[PDB]
Amino acid sequence: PLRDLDSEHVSKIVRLSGIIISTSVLSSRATYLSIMCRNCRHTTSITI
């Protein structure tokens, strides 16, 4: 039950049941970034 979750379950895997009442709008997050330095123009990359 949703009312039975507590400290012992933190960071473990759980299975829960209920009813969806609200979904939000889609957001954007980065998975690969190409960056540059605005002074010396040194370039690199980042991966998520």
Partner 1 sequence: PRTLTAQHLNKLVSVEGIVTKTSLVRPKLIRSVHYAAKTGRFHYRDYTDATTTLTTRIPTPAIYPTEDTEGNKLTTEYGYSTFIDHQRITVQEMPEMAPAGQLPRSIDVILDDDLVDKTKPGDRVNVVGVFKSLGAGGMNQSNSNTLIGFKTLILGNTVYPLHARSTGVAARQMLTDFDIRNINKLSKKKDIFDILSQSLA
Cβ-based nearer residue to partner 1, 22 or 47: 47
The whole-angstrom separation of Cα 22 and Cα 9 is 25
Give the binding-site size for Zn ion (rule: CB under 5 A): 4
Q: Integer distance in angstroms from the first to the last C-alpha of the chain?
A: 34
* Residue 8 three-state SS: helix
**Which stretch, 2-10, 16-24, 40-48, contacts partner 1 (CB under 8 A)?**
40-48
**In angstroms, what is the minimal distance from the CB of 41 to partner 1?**
6
Binding site for partner 1 (CB under 8 A): 34, 39-43, 45
